[PDB]
């Protein structure tokens, strides 16, 4: 290794529903120069082979939770702790503290004068004071349903089990600083994006002093 100083950087997250158009506005945030930080990205990674999470899979639960090329058997893992509500909390109390880290690791290597952190779920997690700033992507319930269909290829059934767990609209904009109206054209997202931009390096250089 090399030597670094632990520094903090100014961290925006970015929060909606699942259908809501986080990608998007996530990508117009990283044509701007802004390191974006993706905590679903970050959920896979921290279950690579060989990496802590799932080398402690493996022991709890035994090799059938291993695919034969050493990656992690994720309709097996899903179907266990389905069943086992032990399972279920044991995973979440291995995998939340590792997530963290992995993201503050990797936030710590950036060069950004400020992060774009990206949680789906941080008003569900309760993670809101993690951020200096919250924004939120705002679709009606229904665009949210329609997308996933669309998308995922799923029923509307199935969009709605997957959103019976999340937020309401108005619950995660009552979590809100910043909020976009993902319905526009895309050019109207990137200038709401470009506003915002240039409103959080101003934020982020006065908060530099600190």
Same mark, same amino acid.
């Given at each position: 290794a090399h030597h670094h100083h632990h520094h903090m950087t100014y961290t925006v997250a970015l929060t909606g529903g699942i259908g809501s158009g986080k990608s998007t506005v996530a990508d117009e945030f990283a044509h701007l120069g802004v390191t974006v930080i993706d905590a679903d990205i970050i959920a896979r990674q921290v279950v690579e082979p060989g990496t802590p999470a799932l080398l402690a899979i493996a022991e709890r639960?035994?090799?059938?939770?291993?695919? %034969?090329?050493?990656?992690? +058997?994720r309709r097996r893992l899903r179907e266990r702790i389905f069943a086992h509500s032990e399972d279920k909390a044991w995973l979440n109390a291995l995998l939340h503290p590792l997530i963290q880290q992995e993201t503050r690791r990797q936030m710590q290597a950036s060069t950004s004068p400020y992060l774009l952190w990206v949680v789906p779920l941080l008003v569900e997690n309760r993670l809101? %004071?993690?951020?200096?700033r919250i924004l939120v992507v705002d679709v009606p319930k229904e665009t949210q349903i329609e997308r996933t269909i669309r998308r995922d290829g799923v029923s509307r059934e199935h969009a709605e089990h997957i959103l019976a767990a999340q937020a309401t609209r108005e619950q995660r904009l009552a979590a809100a600083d910043d909020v976009i109206? +993902?319905?526009?054209?895309a050019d109207a997202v990137a200038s709401h994006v470009a506003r915002l931009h240039d409103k959080y390096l101003m934020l982020a250089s006065q908060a530099a002093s600190q």
């Open positions: 639960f035994g090799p059938q939770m291993i695919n %034969d090329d050493g990656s992690l +058997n809101t %004071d993690k951020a200096d109206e +993902n319905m526009g054209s």
